[PDB]
Amino acid sequence: GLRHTFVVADATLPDCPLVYASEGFYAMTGYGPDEVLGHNCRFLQGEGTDPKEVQKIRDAIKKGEACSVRLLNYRKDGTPFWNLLTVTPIKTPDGRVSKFVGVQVDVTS
Numbered sequence: 476g477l478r479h480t481f482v483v484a485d486a487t488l489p490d491c492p493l494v495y496a497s498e499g500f501y502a503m504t505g506y507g508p509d510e511v512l513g514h515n516c517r518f519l520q521g522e523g524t525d526p527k528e529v530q531k532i533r534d535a536i537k538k539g540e541a542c543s544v545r546l547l548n549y550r551k552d553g554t555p556f557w558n559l560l561t562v563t564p565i566k567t568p569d570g571r572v573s574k575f576v577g578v579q580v581d582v583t584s
């Protein structure tokens with residue numbers, strides 16, 4: 476299959492911290508668990524990230540909807556890569572959002 480990475484954000488905490496990341500996520504971004512867990516995913520953004528697409532994810536997360544955007548992201552060493560990000564909300568039976576899950580693909584090609 477295509478090369479992707481996977482994370483889980485906790486939506487019971489107000490700023491959606493990451494609580495789990497696949498090994499490829501660390502290997503792709505250059506960050507380790509000590510710098511990823513407990514933090515919001517936006518640390519991967521930087522100068523060239525498009526604010527209009529960031530705002531697309533912000534709104535989908537507040538509305539508890541799925542969302543797919545492509546973002547410029549930066550590895551720990553500063554170098555950029557194009558991240559095709561799909562976020563999916565996970566609900567409890569009472570309709571509340573408990574977790575957000577994300578598939579991240581590096582589409583720099």
Ligand SMILES: *[C@@]12=NC3=[C]C([C])=C([C])[C]=C3N([C][C]([O])[C]([O])[C]([O])[C]OP([O])([O])=O)C1=NC(=O)[N]C2=O
Pocket residue numbers: 482483484491515516517518519520529530532533536546548558560562575576577579
């Ligand atoms: C990030 N992946 C990612 C994965 C999940 C499951 C979630 C919920 C969010 C992300 N983000 C974005 C970030 O957490 C936030 O949702 C947005 O930046 C919008 O909110 P703000 O407050 O910044 O307007 C991811 N962002 C990335 O840049 N790279 C990812 O891999």
